[PDB]
A paper describes a structure:
The human α7 nicotinic receptor is a pentameric channel mediating cellular and neuronal communication. To develop a novel class of α7 ligands, we recently generated two nanobodies named E3 and C4, acting as positive allosteric modulator and silent allosteric ligand, respectively. E3 and C4 bind to a common epitope involving two subunits at the apex of the receptor. In this study, we solved five structures of the α7-nAChR in complex with two nanobodies, unraveling a common epitope at the apex of the receptor, which is formed by the MIR and the N-terminal helices from two adjacent subunits.
We then solved the structure of α7∆ICDcryo with a 50-fold excess of the E3 nanobody, with and without 100 µM nicotine, with an overall resolution of 2.6 and 2.8 Å in the ECD/nanobody region, respectively, and low signal in the TMD. Five E3 molecules are bound in a similar arrangement to the one seen for C4. The E3-Nic structure shows an ECD conformation very close to that of C4-Nic, including the five bound nicotine molecules, consistent with agonist-bound conformations of the ECD. As seen with C4, nicotine binding triggers a small motion of the tip of the nanobody away from the channel axis. First, E3 harbors the “canonical” disulfide bond that links the strands that just precede the CDR1 and CDR3, which is missing in C4. Second, the CDR3 of E3 is longer by two residues and is bent upward by the presence of an extra disulfide bond between the end of the CDR3 and the second β-strand of the framework region 3 (FR3). In addition, E3 shows a unique interaction between the Arg56CDR2 guanidinium and both the main chain carbonyl and the first glycan grafted on α7Asn23 (pre-β1), an interaction absent in C4 that harbors an alanine in place of the arginine at this position. In C4, Tyr60, Ser63 and Lys 66 contact n+1 Gln2 and Gln4 and in E3, Asn62 and Lys65 contact n+1 Gln3 and Gln5 and Gln 116. The CDR3 of E3 also contributes to the interface, the guanidinium of Arg108 lying near the carboxylate of Asp 113, suggesting a salt-bridge interaction.
Author numbering:
A (entry chain F), G (entry chain J), H (entry chain G), I (entry chain I), J (entry chain H): 1 to 124
B (entry chain A), C (entry chain B), D (entry chain E), E (entry chain C), F (entry chain D): 1 to 208
The structure:
């Protein structure tokens, strides 16, 4: 919703679960889609998961297909990302980006600039 | 400046080729109405009727919406032709060489996403004039409007009564009324029914 | 929203200048048909015939296809002029100053890639009217349609019977039939044969 | 070269769809005036009046401004159609088939942001001619101009006296005056009042 | 698919404003010819002749070439207007208001780079009709075609005999022949000679 | 190939909206001339004169220049409409519905930056015909041309004598001469003087 | 205003305040908006704060939302950025960029090239 | 087919053969072309091989022209890349990308974003 | 003028002056503008100074505004850049770029590719 | 000609000559131009020399103007680059790129993607 901010990062142990929350502000949260990206320490930004503006369409990566989930909450203007069975290669910075009336796809040309994300680290 | 911000936000990810529906499984409702202003000419030899008419189309977009509290002072926007989705309403019984004789204007949208479109024009249509009862006779001329490429299950066309408040009386013909009727037909080209709206002129010759 | 996704996916890598064929070594089959609605005028002095006609062109794209199960609620799409390949069918014996007198409309495509195109128009053609047998005589006016730049080995044109279901009887002329015939000719410009379709009007004067 | 720099600087971030207002909560004031040059024809049978007229529209942009000291030698700029915001002034009682019969020209802007627009044209309008007093009679023909999509609270239209300095006398009709009047009306389409400006021709037939 | 690859390869680095010559120091040779089909009307009062004619222009590009062995199944391509260089051939003695009355069609190119262009049209030209020998007389009407902006040293125009194979005899005038001639003239505007091609109609009135 | 390189180099940083002047503080000099070819019609009832005319405009760009030694074989270039700056010369006393009736052609430029523009057309203008001296009388019809948005201090318009070398004598009217005159006027719209050029027809009726 | 130059950087201690000044020259300062960006030593440029050409609209980041403020002064052709309660992660190079009749948004496509900025360092 | 995922990587010895499989999901596999790219540890992404949507056109690099081969299988929605006589310089990450009705060319503008690839290493 | 080449670099001491010459070849030198850029060892390219095609307009950076000067010479087809009171941070590679009928502005979109420049180093 | 491959690299001593050959395949070699680029170990790609499709136009860099030469051979579908008096700074990777009906200019927008080049090293 115009301006999205992610939170919920921290330090977790391998095999645990984590819940990240992206809160919207500055506009109507029901008119935009939410997409998640990972920055990684020395790699490029990569798509993770996305949900459409109505919640009827969802998209996930291939290494996250079975372990992550995405949900919406218009009452709190918040999107929730649930990660289960975390692995050491999941340590990175997660950022949340909006998309006006998006279809919840992996295309990067329908999203806006991501905000300041949250760092998460997984220890073996 | 909030108008620039509103326009830039609205233009994002918009596709003029997409019907502005929220479900894709239900028809979009469009209200259609007419406003006659003058019967410029009635041609008997060529069986042609010329009139000045404003069309009225009303619908909803669901993609052009905003909170007025976040854009103070802005309550309506206007879009030119070719930048937003518009119904393809055409006159079936057209006699003009160009077929379509409507002057394209802007489309006005308010905060709720309601779009109105009122093109003015001078329409020529083929009508049959009977002169058997020359001194006294009532002529019925029909104008049929409908969507050309959008049929049932996609566009639900509803009718509204015609407006004759600004009608200018003619010196040789007197108007009795302009009744309208909505019908649905089947064409051999496709198995999908198509709706249409027909208006009647109901002119009468003045005995002088 | 699935309509946006479908449109965006379809538009990718599409080139309007390419004939939508799957082999490039076989002609593309196009079915052509006519639908007359009214003989507006028959000019004897100028040897010109005016009529209201809808053209019907049907073909297949093979590039506009999708699985309806992955795009629920979407079963047809519509494309405007200049965004997809379209046959260049023209009337050879045209008498209008513009030569081409067809109003361009949208092209409708279903899940299988079948494209239909039905432009309406008012066509003026040159016809020879014989008045030797004035009180009683049958006039034959021919309308010839064909592709201008696509010949044999590229576009295979097939004919379909004309539709006269919605024909409006004329007060001075009576229609007997509109037979059609497909022919193939050679022109001195090129050694490639070109097909064409010719329809006959077969009008008769009313004795009153 | 300073003209290139000025044009490049002005074009930045400009949106033709935005009304050039500084507050968004107040109407933009537009001054409208007419300049008649010749009454080319007066048609009695068809109730049509043909004249040659130049329109005059003046307003302010607030987005096209510069300091002349930083761009020496540059004091005015000109923009073509479709690159800057322009009022949609139209003639309500138009009789031309195209409805709009104005030739689009450039818009001139000076350092302060003042924009002028003077399109020339030949306008055909529907007028009622009374021939009861054939040898002696004065005919009143009205020309009504107004904004089509911009109403009150958005565009404040003001009137200026018509110019007849370059008028060419007609050999059969004599002009008495061209009074103008500004009015505001309500239409059933919207609850927002719309202003308009009406000019009168006041022709007189010459007794010869 | 090889058609897409061929089109994409051909479009690269192409500039429509460049004359498709290989040396830049030699003129490009263009062959011009005519094909008359019907003398629709001969106006004596207005000194105007109306006919249906197909133009024929042939030249070579040298930029649109490919090896058919690397693109199996592809032997010809077609380009619309405004995407490739085309000669600006115009009729000098035009009487139509638009001046140019040609319907633009596709340009066909084969593997060797040979381009053909055959626009159809209805041309109106000013001709002098002498009625001194009313019952018996032969009328000569000339049609002059030439390049408007390309003169000698740039475009070498060659003539080809006119085709009358598909000519439709007229009921009031009989054609004797359509001789053609190539000439070169000097104009006061420029010192560069300009070639042109003139065709003669040679009509004869039928004594009935 | 040097033509491609020259075109690519010239197109860089060019802005069609900028007047091609080198100082910005001095007017650009434009030479204007006429070339009449035929008086097609003289309408007395409607007070309209129809003629075939070629306009001639000459000026300098200063932005389109190159050294012929670095581009061997290239000495002239041609630019279409809308890609380079062009004067907005219009006919003030136009009677055509479109007002402007000129066919746009290419603009030719040589190595020194000199641009020529010769549009052909059929112009209709309003002229007063006096029939008091019916058998013997000389009619004076004036054609006034000028810039619409460029006035003094910006565009200095100079006149050149008209060319009648290719004039075709008329069967009913005889031309005596086409004198031209340059004038400068003030308009109430702006305080900047505007120049214009007026040509006279000087026709005479043939006594037969 | 055509050419903007930032100044006021220096060395400060954690928890202190700092005032940066961006001065305009080369044009009318009232026809342009002002945006602030941070370069950081080894990271990419990031938006910080922005103000519209009329001062009626302002925008801030999420980690700076409550601690920074932006103001205008047409008399001196200067924009002022006030930073309160500085933190160690705020050490970077700050640059000032103009935008003709900008809306004071975070979009980077409506701004011009930033000038030479000022380095600021925060010591724990 | 909308979403392509590559697999089959591992550790091999110089002079051996390897078979990589790119599986499609999310759409019709017969409407898209398949292209292969190599990332390399410290170099940029480079094209390797490609096949058209119908299998009638194929394209290869110059250092892979004689040693690699590409095949299709619509029954399993899988493209197969066979590498023979591997060399030490072939150690990299291989990624698979789709192209709707592609011609099997090396142009990068007709392909979509590549997915998460497979790492392969060759030991002398 | 189509092809510009810079020269005059060398080693100088802090507080001295230096004159760099950019010579044109391959076209008419009076139809193009000249712009100067600095590469720097580990930073990005930055504009320094520029002069219009007629010499009536000039533009400079903010750290070079008072110390550098630019002049033209059509007789020798050469642009001259004079640097006074050099500082240690001025050590970099200077490159010269043309612009056809340029206005002598800092915009990078109206210039062509820079050539091979000259290295200059300042020792404290 | 559609696909160009360069060869002829090796190790040479300073002051010697070297001949590199770029062979064409996949199309008509007479319809395309040939351009040469150098990659360098830690620098960006730079133009070196180019020849038009007809051989009537040639272009060279400024540090290579007098020492290098370029020639065509349609019989063997090969472009030849001759380098004389090599210098230590010429050690880099040379790549060959095609251009359909090119004018032999330095513009990079009229060329296609370069292929796999040849490494050349010069020892003092
Ligand atoms: C925008 O306009 C719509 C329609 O005019 C308003 O929604 C209602 O629409 C129905 C017809 O569809 C009208 O009968 C109602 O009167 C409308 N509600 C009103 C006028 O309050 C909608 O409220 C408008 N949005 C605004 C005013 O913010
Ligand atoms: C899309 O339309 C086509 C054609 O209407 C359907 O394919 C068949 O086409 C032939 C003519 O080419 C018809 O005679 C058949 O009746 C069509 N099959 C039908 C109607 O089942 C195709 O099935 C349509 N695709 C759909 C409905 O998903
Ligand atoms: C630009 O033009 C405007 C209007 O012509 C000038 O501002 C004043 O505008 C009012 C009408 O809105 C006129 O009555 C005044 O005469 C105008 N002031 C003048 C003419 O001094 C404005 O000054 C002009 N800008 C200039 C000349 O730099
Ligand atoms: C492409 O067409 C051209 C011209 O039709 C063929 O080249 C020759 O052109 C001349 C006229 O310029 C004709 O008289 C010859 O008959 C043409 N040669 C033929 C027909 O063999 C050219 O061969 C054609 N390319 C093909 C067929 O691949
Ligand atoms: C390009 O054309 C111009 C004008 O035709 C030539 O410059 C002179 O222009 C004046 C009128 O402005 C003529 O009277 C002269 O005759 C022209 N000089 C000539 C013809 O030598 C200019 O020389 C031309 N450039 C060339 C030929 O390279
Ligand atoms: C769309 O309409 C169908 C029936 O027309 C309905 O079953 C479905 O629930 C609707 N979509 C949503 C999101 O409710
Ligand atoms: C619009 O924004 C205001 C301010 O945040 C809020 O109170 C109001 O509920 C919003 N309107 C809607 C329809 O949510
Ligand atoms: C294309 O058609 C030719 C004959 O017309 C045939 O031999 C060929 O097999 C067809 N293409 C395919 C892919 O089957
Ligand atoms: C469309 O998708 C469904 C769901 O995966 C599948 O069962 C069906 O076979 C697909 N249709 C075709 C023609 O492959
Ligand atoms: C805009 O107008 C409203 C009233 O029309 C006024 O209250 C407001 O102050 C104006 N805007 C500004 C910036 O003054
Ligand atoms: C225009 O610039 C000059 C020179 O800096 C300045 O003196 C003048 O005040 C400026 N004009 C305005 C209206 O600020
Ligand atoms: C171009 O033509 C000139 C003479 O017209 C000739 O001297 C020259 O050799 C030709 N070009 C080539 C490449 O042969
Ligand atoms: C076209 O390609 C084939 C196959 O390589 C070749 O044999 C033939 O010579 C080529 N044609 C020409 C004109 O070079
Ligand atoms: C431009 O013209 C003015 C006077 O009209 C003159 O003073 C000035 O010097 C001219 N420009 C140049 C560069 O000479
Ligand atoms: C054009 O280039 C040639 C060759 O360098 C040169 O001799 C001549 O002086 C140039 N022309 C002009 C006007 O400078
Ligand atoms: C319902 N329409 C009106 C008459 C033709 C018909 C139609 C059907 C499909 C595509 N275009 C037009
Ligand atoms: C078959 N067409 C119709 C008449 C001309 C002919 C034709 C041939 C090639 C290119 N355009 C037109
Ligand atoms: C005021 N206009 C003139 C008549 C129709 C009316 C109108 C209202 C809204 C949108 N378009 C037109
Ligand atoms: C040869 N053309 C035909 C008549 C005008 C002349 C011409 C010359 C230069 C530019 N345009 C037209
Ligand atoms: C000089 N022109 C001719 C008549 C109107 C006048 C004019 C002035 C300013 C802008 N447009 C037109």
């Amino acid at each position: 919703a115009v301006q999205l901010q992610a939170s919920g990062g921290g330090l977790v142990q391998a095999g645990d679960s984590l819940r990240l929350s992206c809160a919207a502000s500055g506009g109507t949260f029901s008119h935009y889609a939410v997409g998640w990206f990972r920055q990684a320490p020395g790699k490029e930004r990569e798509f993770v998961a996305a949900i459409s503006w109505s919640g009827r369409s969802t998209s996930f990566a291939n290494s996250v297909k079975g372990r992550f989930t995405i949900s919406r909450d218009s009452a709190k203007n918040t999107a929730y990302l649930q990660m289960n069975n975390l692995k050491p290669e999941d340590t990175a910075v997660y950022c949340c980006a909006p998309a006006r009336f998006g279809t919840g796809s992996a295309a990067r040309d329908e999203y806006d600039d991501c905000g300041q994300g949250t760092q998460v680290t997984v220890s073996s | 400046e909030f108008q620039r911000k509103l326009y830039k936000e609205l233009v994002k990810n918009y596709n003029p080729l997409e019907r502005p529906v929220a479900n894709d499984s239900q028809p979009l409702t469009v209200y259609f109405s007419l406003s006659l202003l003058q019967i410029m000419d009635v041609d008997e030899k060529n069986q042609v009727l010329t009139t000045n008419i404003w069309l009225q189309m009303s619908w909803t977009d669901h993609y052009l919406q905003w909170n007025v509290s976040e854009y103070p002072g802005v309550k309506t926007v206007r879009f030119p032709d070719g930048q937003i989705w518009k119904p393809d309403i055409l006159l079936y019984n057209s006699a003009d060489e160009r077929f379509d004789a409507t002057f394209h204007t802007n489309v006005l949208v308010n905060s709720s996403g309601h779009c109105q479109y009122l093109p003015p024009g001078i329409f020529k249509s083929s009508c049959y004039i009977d002169v058997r009862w020359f001194p006294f006779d009532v002529q019925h001329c029909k104008l049929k409007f409908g969507s050309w490429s959008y049929g049932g299950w996609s566009l639900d066309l509803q009718m509204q009564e015609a407006d004759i408040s600004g009608y200018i009386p003619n010196g040789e013909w007197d108007l009795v009324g302009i009744p309208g009727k909505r019908s649905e037909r089947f064409y051999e080209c496709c198995k999908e029914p198509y709706p249409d709206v027909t208006f009647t002129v109901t002119m009468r010759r003045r005995t002088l």
